[PDB]
Write a protein that binds this ligand. Structure first.
Ligand SMILES: N[C@H](Cc1c[nH]c2ccccc12)C(=O)O
Ligand SMILES: N[C@H](Cc1c[nH]c2ccccc12)C(=O)O
Ligand SMILES: N[C@H](Cc1c[nH]c2ccccc12)C(=O)O
Ligand SMILES: N[C@H](Cc1c[nH]c2ccccc12)C(=O)O
Ligand SMILES: N[C@H](Cc1c[nH]c2ccccc12)C(=O)O
Ligand SMILES: N[C@H](Cc1c[nH]c2ccccc12)C(=O)O
Ligand SMILES: N[C@H](Cc1c[nH]c2ccccc12)C(=O)O
Ligand SMILES: N[C@H](Cc1c[nH]c2ccccc12)C(=O)O
Ligand SMILES: [Mn+2]
Ligand SMILES: [Mn+2]
Ligand SMILES: [Mn+2]
Ligand SMILES: [Mn+2]
Lengths: 458, 456, 456, 458
């Protein structure tokens, strides 16, 4: 009839002082919010206020410690996953593939950087997106991600449905459960992950190019074993969860109070470990920035080509008022043709504040174009070149190129042009599967890690 | 108040399909009565969801249960009698995880060997009933996977959407159990501090002070010897429930890769499951389903168990003689266990198979109070574990573990303990959706008492 | 019966040469009387030999002694009163190492904190004498570094070749101590098994059974919690002796590299040394020598110690306020310790320096038996440690350690203990070349008793 | 007067059954023995029978386990030190230097081999040597090593002096004490040792040649740390002690019985962990081979160019009668011009026995010549080439090139020609300090390790 099933829905409030501060923050204007009825939103938030959290505060405190090391130039941040997760594709094979692809990158980057890599997935919550246009090319209300409405090009599917708040949480908690299982039970074994990398080198069209570094890494691993390193710390990995904090109904409902066995109680957003604010919602006096101000999680802000040095400093002063290294990550996405010019005066001005942000490169979102064959796509070479320029900016300034933020999948999709597979405009039509932006496929994402490893090694 | 999910629009190896079909074609007791087409829709949803557990965890559990079977570890299994969707919250889950960990510390010290920790959690949403009409003249409550606790006819109708609600709640609970155990709740030193606070405040804490202090001095000894808090920071808590609703269990089957031997069916709704008294028909679907899955399994054994039938369970469910694959869960009643258990243990031991012998001291010791509550006396619960130990000591066999129903809540559900919970007291916080649980103090007191059994 | 060694045919920093010269120019008590030119030849040999210890070990010991001084570890120091060349054998060295380890296990459990293990070994070859003529009318025996034990005049002549014989024996003993401690003698589980055998066979083993079993259950708990035998397989035993013969100690000085701060003189005849009652003249060469070397040092404090003099030792020997650099070693007599120690501890604590307070319960409790033997009563030895603990408990200060004279041999040298060694018994195996030692059973019994003091 | 000092000398016997077997073995003829009086030898043996052992049996059992792994192709044996230790040069700086030089080699070989390296020093007992001629070029009785007589060209010094048995033990136990201290207290820290290697690359004349591999190793080490390997297993190293078992008075006096907490009591030679029998004393029916037969230690036999395949098999049958992998090491020293020809039929015949020996290359003792300027010397290139040929023999046969046995020192001596320093015949006169054969100096020994690492990597 509909080919759906309906699932029926049937504790103490947050402290009054923290709620008072939250309410003053959320009184600010919020861009890009769903347009569902307030009373229905309230009902769904009330459901979510009672569910088990996706993450817990001690994990977020640990992440914060590891991100402080990144900010101080003593680790590197890898952040990667789908552009937009869908409920339909939130499956074991797909989750496992994206976790594998992230781990494979991390091995190569760890060796290249000669320092720890903090692994943060875009996963278990990346279900909401902004739109510039409220009507899409089919004359429909725009798809806004599965937390808000449906991808299917159908008017009914596109109506904003607050029950998707609860479907999002179910999907997020189920995905996170599996990410925890996979990372603690042997998928994330260093030797197993490297074996996958060896197979990539064996079969890639440009594997000859990456053979030398792959063999080095292999000889590094075998050296560890030769020296009598026990495989204990090598058996499991930590993968943290992240998404864009966009739908404030969801994020506010997933706020919890820490139990104060750590230093004192505060608000954590336990929908994720770390979240970032996007280019379309980072209004300095808007609700998203004010929400980020109130929560204890590490946070990031996207910085595009219109960014000024002065506005960047404002973000730093609002979001890192206590000068905690790693609390704030500034995520540059300029375009490969602009990054070398636009980034330096922003970095200089922010460095002069005495604060220590993480400088992270997003080489995807500034390098998107439309193909002749009608697909939204990005060229691999432009993605690579923005990271190259980003490294050059930091090397010239003596600052730390702190990490990358990429959109990838373990699927063999045909979404970005180029790479060693030499994906063409024609090829795009084969497996163009993204519900939003074009992702690096599993080979392209690994090839990028090898290339960035060589940047790190210089 | 509906959320809504879409019904999704590589085949099993032929032999596994054949064997699964044959198992599920056998008669199955205690199944919900809902329409086949609606059940199919829900199963098709569940066949696509992320699993609650993964096969490598289950293989690890099997290794650790083999050590139990060989007399080199002890099995602690505990949690709610029935999880509810309403009470599937962070505080409640944290409390039950804490209560299990607290027990495990005391039992680990008492046993002088590792304790395998298995929660009744993230799936324990279905129960059998002897009668389909209850004392109020309603269709019986069968757990939140099947129908609703509320005493009205509409709530008690069997609703297949509860299959998917059960999974949602299970996966969210399991996520949190993983987080809590890897991120410091399960720190050995933190858990023991809770035990010290119990001794401080219990009415019979004087009784348990000496052993508590011994444990404390054992922990400090580790630190004194330069043991780093690496192995001590985190714990493994496995998930278990009664495999009852075969619509749910069959939909949560996944095929392993052939990285370990050959491809097998794992039930990834849990790490380990057990078959109950009312569904363990030797030629029934539940026992046959258990034969087809790779998980470690248990079978409840009540007072009508024969030595010969016990051997037949062993031979059907442990056909490859894999130590720890099968757990036999005695629940006899404290007045019967000493008499009924020995000839069952003797006969099974003579097979050359190595089962885990596990004591369930709850389900054989239930009575109704004057004040109308289903309850159990603490002293009878303790005494069945005592008798169980005596049976094994006399035979030279391994008293392998306990299976108890507990909660971290301060409920008033079982009589007695050091709090001396009375029939009157029961009315205060009788919160269980099914059987009476040991509250958090009673569960810890039981662990101290069983530690003293282990030490003798 | 001579082996023969050749006299070997970068200058100190000027300030260290100046300070060493000034120290050694001060008056030195209790020195051998042998010709300067012969002493010089021997020192020149010793200036070229491989050191018994190395500076990084001494820096590590200093770190571990700082933890003792801060109340976070306990110091066990024990071995022969006087090592002899004749008894410097594998069995004897192994026995004394075993006896020290056995004590350390019990004390570690009792203290609930790490025990720093320091043997009187690999150098303890020289002793002071109050009288230069002994009861037989001979020149007194002064230890094998100086002259011979045999009661005849020729053997008692001071012989500087014994300097080099002492080093040879020391370095050979230290080699073996290193081998034994890294290669399984010092395995925690093996050492505890020896303790279990003692409880099995001692006449008062019933008395110590409960604590022995507690310790056993503590060890098994570690294993149960999945502690790997990595940290448990090996132990560190440091070497110590009284720094008495300044010809020997000065020849065994080596200059550190400047990898840790600046170059310093280390005495590499040992890890730590102490200055005795008869050589601790505040303006004498021994105290000045101790000021110049980087090793942790101790000073013996007897019944005539004032609080003011104790403070002067602290200020001279710990001028930089480095916790654990100085150990003050109380030896008062069991009848005096409670009275004499408190005002010394109070005054020193008020300085803001953190010394190690260590009990030597032997040297203040020596008497002569009817049957002619120098002996000590076990009960008086125990009682001085008891009083020492009482002094510290009353003051809120740290009873930091003990310094005892023990052997792994079944000798008959100290009266009493559970064996009830009598005056008659003494004649059986009175084997010490100087003071009466606790035998292997008495030394272990003492550790059990001091563990109970630690537990109160 | 003499410029010496005299040191005066002042327990249950070994079991009667073991002594009976020992006496039957030592009844055999023994070559190259000192000629001191029997009654004086007996007195000195009686002294030594009572001294603390240099090594203990549990260490030797552990070595045997690690050598079994070498024999099975899963580890590599490095054995190195002075040709002849002297008492005069048995000092802290010299011992420390030789330990450092061995460790430096081991790091490079571990990385190159991608498997553990068993580190065995020629040290703490290498005090005795054979001679072909009983009169030397000065018309004196030949120097036979400090255990027997004195190096000084003086008739009195050259008389065989049994008190040197006890001086040898004193020196051995003092050296071993220090080797234990150094290896457990931070000299043997992996990172510290590698830093020395970095400094060598910085300053060697051919450091450009070895820079790439040095940097690889550095990046391997930093990878370990990046992956969160704790520096516990990396802080200390095991260095075992070895010498040629030549003077049977010494070796027999240092026999001890194991305490039988291991499987059963037997005779261990506790003067060392492992000993070998030389080319001049390996008579198949001689006392040295029979002594090696009776002791439990791992043992080696030198095989020179006159070796037959049949005699090699005889050694295997006498010395490894229980087919214990690693118990026997066969140490080829052929000459670089002969090894490729002479070794293969020996390896083939021995492999066919079903026994697993360690095949170890001694590239020194077959490659010695006299310079025009009068010095006994070896060319670096010939030393390297014999190891090269040795590897080629094993690669062709599918057998395991199991290790090397070299004569090295941490001193900057001028004893072997060539290397990157290009040591000439003229240069030899500068620091020719060996009491017997020419050693690789500290730079040459490290350069050899780099070159053999490249052999391992092929
Ligand atoms: N693909 C998902 C299926 C899903 C994930 N978590 C839950 C929880 C409860 C029911 C279904 C699911 C979906 O379409 O939501
Ligand atoms: N486990 C040690 C690691 C090590 C420590 N120092 C060194 C020096 C050279 C090689 C290795 C090591 C080992 O592999 O022996
Ligand atoms: N206690 C839960 C609340 C809830 C609603 N949807 C989900 C999804 C996943 C976990 C929990 C929940 C209930 O009433 O079902
Ligand atoms: N880390 C060691 C543990 C140990 C090993 N053997 C012994 C013997 C006695 C006491 C302790 C130990 C240590 O704590 O010294
Ligand atoms: N007990 C020793 C035996 C001995 C003789 N020379 C040495 C050298 C090193 C150690 C011991 C010995 C003694 O009588 O001196
Ligand atoms: N390896 C863990 C140690 C541990 C950590 N937390 C707890 C709580 C209760 C018992 C033990 C542990 C283990 O033994 O399970
Ligand atoms: N160079 C050494 C010095 C030596 C080494 N060990 C001992 C023991 C006793 C006396 C001297 C030495 C030598 O010439 O023997
Ligand atoms: N301690 C882990 C090591 C590790 C395990 N799996 C992976 C995968 C990719 C990189 C590293 C690791 C860590 O460094 O995160
Ligand atoms: Mn995107
Ligand atoms: Mn129940
Ligand atoms: Mn004394
Ligand atoms: Mn040589």
């Amino acid at each position: 009839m509909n080919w759906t099933v309906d699932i029926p829905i049937d504790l103490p409030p947050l402290p009054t002082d923290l709620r008072t501060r939250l309410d003053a923050a959320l009184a600010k204007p919020a861009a890009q919010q769903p347009t569902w009825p307030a009373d229905q939103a309230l009902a769904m938030r009330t459901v979510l206020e009672s569910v088990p959290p996706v993450t817990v505060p001690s994990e977020i405190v640990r992440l914060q410690e590891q991100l402080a090391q990144v900010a101080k130039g003593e680790a590197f941040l890898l952040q990667g996953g789908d552009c937009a997760e869908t409920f339909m594709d939130n499956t074991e094979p797909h989750i496992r593939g994206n976790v594998r692809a992230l781990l494979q990158m991390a091995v190569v980057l760890t060796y290249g950087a000669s320092m720890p890599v903090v692994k943060v997935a875009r996963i278990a919550g990346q279900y909401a997106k902004p739109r510039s246009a409220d009507i899409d090319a089919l004359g429909l209300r725009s798809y806004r991600g599965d937390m808000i409405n449906g991808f299917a090009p159908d008017a009914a599917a596109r109506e904003h449905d607050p029950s998707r708040l609860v479907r999002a949480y179910a999907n997020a908690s189920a995905a996170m459960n599996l990410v925890r299982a996979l990372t603690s039970s042997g998928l994330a074994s260093l030797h197993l992950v490297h074996d996958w990398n060896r197979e990539f080198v064996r079969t890639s069209p440009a594997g000859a190019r990456y053979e030398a570094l792959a063999t080095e890494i292999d000889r590094g691993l075998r050296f560890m074993s030769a020296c009598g390193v026990a495989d204990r710390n090598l058996q499991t990995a930590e993968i943290y969860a992240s998404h864009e904090a966009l739908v404030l109904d969801y994020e506010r409902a997933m706020l919890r109070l820490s139990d104060g066995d750590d230093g004192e109680p505060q608000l954590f957003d336990l929908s994720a470990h770390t979240v970032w604010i996007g280019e379309r919602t980072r209004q300095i006096d808007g609700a998203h920035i004010a929400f980020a101000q109130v929560i204890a999680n590490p946070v990031g802000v996207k910085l595009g080509p219109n960014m000024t040095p002065e506005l960047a400093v404002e973000y730093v002063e609002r979001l890192d008022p206590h000068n905690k290294p790693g609390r704030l990550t500034l995520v540059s996405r300029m375009g490969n043709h602009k990054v070398r010019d636009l980034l330096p005066p922003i970095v200089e001005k922010v460095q002069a504040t005495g604060h220590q942000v993480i400088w992270q490169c997003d080489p995807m979102h500034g390098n998107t174009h439309e193909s002749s064959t009608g697909f939204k796509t990005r060229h691999f070479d432009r993605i690579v070149d923005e990271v190259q320029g980003f490294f050059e900016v930091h090397r010239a300034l003596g600052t730390h190129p702190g990490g990358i933020h990429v959109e990838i999948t373990g699927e063999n999709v045909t979404e970005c042009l180029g790479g060693a597979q030499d994906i063409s405009e024609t090829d795009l039509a084969g497996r163009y599967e993204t519900a939003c932006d074009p992702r690096l496929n599993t080979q392209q994402s690994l090839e990028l890690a090898f290339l960035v490893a060589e940047m790190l090694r210089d």
